Amino acid sequence: MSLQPLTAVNCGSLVQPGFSLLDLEGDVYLFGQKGWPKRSCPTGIFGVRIKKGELKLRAISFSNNSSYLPPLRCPAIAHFEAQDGKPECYLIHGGRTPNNELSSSLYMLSVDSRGCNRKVTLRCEEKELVGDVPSARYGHTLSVINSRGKTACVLFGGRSYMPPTERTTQNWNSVVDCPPQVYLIDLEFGCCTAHTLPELTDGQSFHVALARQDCVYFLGGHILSSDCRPSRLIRLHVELLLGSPVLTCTILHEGLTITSAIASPIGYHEYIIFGGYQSETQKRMECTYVGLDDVGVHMESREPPQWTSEISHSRTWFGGSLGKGTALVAIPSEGNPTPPEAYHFYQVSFQ
Template sequence: MSLQVISAISNSSLLQPGFSLLNFNGRVFFFGQKGWPKRSCPTGVFLLDIKQNELKMKPAFFSKDSCYLPPLRYPALCKLGDNAESDEYQYIIHGGKTPNNDLSDKIYVMSLVSKSSKKNTFKCIEKDLGGDVPEARYGHTINVVRSRGKSVSVIFGGRTYTPLAQRTTEKWNSVVDCLPFVFLIDFEFGCCTSYILPELQDGLAFHVSVAKNDTIYILGGHSLQNNTRSPSLYKLKIDLPLGSPSVTCTILPGGISVSSAIVTQTSDTEFVLVGGYQSDNQKRLVCNTIVLEDSKVEVVERASPDWTPDIKHCRIWFGCDIGEGSVLLGIPGANKQLISDANYFYILRCKEAEEDKEEEMSAQICSQTLTEDPGDSTPFEDSEEFCFSAEANSFDVDDTDTYNEDDEENESETGYWITCSASCSIDINTWVPFYSTELNKPAMILCSSGTGHWVHAQCMDLSETMLLRLSEANVKYFCNEHVDLNKGLQTPQKVVHQKKQPMKPLRRKAAMKITTPAKKSFLRRLFE
């Protein structure tokens, strides 16, 4: 196992505890940002690309026939496909928290319908369910099992808000464990069925679940009611005959007391468990291997990587499975940083060195995570991700939104994305509109030094008012690198508006003349 430091380039504040990862054939997409999406990426879904130890985020798009998908933190995720080797599969997303801390009870199906070097387009569909629909929750798991040629999704665990009738002003947003029901969801008919099993007495959240064929293994988790991390290992077996499904639960020995752990798959039968917490104030630095063979499961301890001092001494940590036996880990940054939400990131490779080299030659490593403020709920349990992506395949379908890659200019070669100065911070992959007049390109202004060159207004620290005045006035502007005593910053002179004289009326009444008595007498005699 090897640990490698990754530097995040801009927008790293979106990578907070609670995010999710969607792995499509080596392309890993970030979902579940902190806060509502901005205009630069209204979908809230980003392609995470790690090259040369640098993490970059590129916005992704939705097709025109997609439904609205809010950014959800701590949802349950799993792949939905006919078989593990199929290129056509989708991701199921259930539950989670919105940026307003509301819990979602909806279930979505996401698929990648178009991919290119410039644009990745998703299609998102909200599924209508009937029957025993699971209540809104977060910190739970969802898995797909297959039996007798059929497949169903299984939801278990999680937390939800206290019922409205039991809420008080002081504890309005307090959470409780969901009842330990097992929900089976048939997407073909859109029906849900709940099961009560005597072996499952207490609710669990932030546990780990691994599925193989018709069996699900549930490991670890935290119970709010008892404030314990159960070392139990549960085995759920689902049988899907022609009639009603059958669900049985068996408690197995050899479990681990851990919550908020991350699982990544290294082979067809092996998974690696890393991270998590073994108590409220102690991280779990030990790693384990989960071996699934036939109908048996074995959890054994394995050699841990050389954790850095920052990881050992930090209070919380979080992360998610990247795929191909790698995990993205994050720890809070120092308080002295300019960006309070900035974090440090690491790539943990769980495969052997030879296997890692083969993977690096054939696939591009990307990443993704969950997002939430530690203060929203329990400081530790709400800080990790609880899903894994063992294999990542994607499928090619005709583009549904008539996007033509040849019609779009290569913005990496145009003048808007140049390095305008030594202090230039504009990047095509992470840029966000700064001025109200910007839409999809940064505002630029011409420097009159020499033959002239263009610079970004944001890099020159120009206010929006000054930028508008410089664009309207006929004055010369010099950038921060070329301004001197002889060529000072030319500010537009104040325009003196001339006072307009009021228009004279077209017709003016003549002054009335007063007739004297003598003249009146003359006129009287004249007409007589």
């Protein structure tokens, strides 16, 4: 366990409080640029490389085949790994664009060509969704499941803007938890099924999802109605049998109280959960290790890296996981005259 300081070198004005790191085929790509894309990099996505403490961002270039994407802030990212037909995909839906609206449109992001010289072209394929469309939402999570042997996806959680009845230009900027109905989205075709369960009383937000072998575990998120941070861990088990994707669920005894957590995969399916917060005021310093098996998910705290007094005293913090037991954290910084760079960074690593 260790952490070391990172200088953001040039162009540290690109990172906004929510954002997303896409780890695919080695190098990871930053996503969710602040504001609208500037033609310095019109694409909107950045390859990120960390060398000798320096954090450098490179300008990715989409393939001609691709649709272009707005810098969504806090979407549901679901990594789908390599298999037929076309690996490997990152499912981004739907976040909210630099203007205030919620996309509610799934995008499939994939690698294309390399290099020639250390160059990676990418392609985004938006997919049409018929339904029973998912309601526009953000902070929700999405996951990839495989049942005998068909692959589908599970979409749940998240806030949305108040429905267009209660909607009022005084209450316009308010949000509310969208109702608790899980959406099963086939990758292809675009059929989106909406089911509900009695076990799910309420909707959640920022609940970190773990997904393995036709089973999905939602950690305790943030419920906006009763303002609780449930220590109840949620499990669900789906199996797709012709012609219906039958679905079940169970509550668990013990689950974590943390919201906005960062899951960095280390082992086969074993993740290290950093967590963003214990409660509304006070962030979580504690680092936790979470593995999962067919029997169940098993929790073991490991000794957290010794935090510099700054990050221990910082009100807010965030980041992403570069994968391979390696992650990035970010600390907002007040200084005058403006640094200008708003965020100090630290790279964290396990073992």
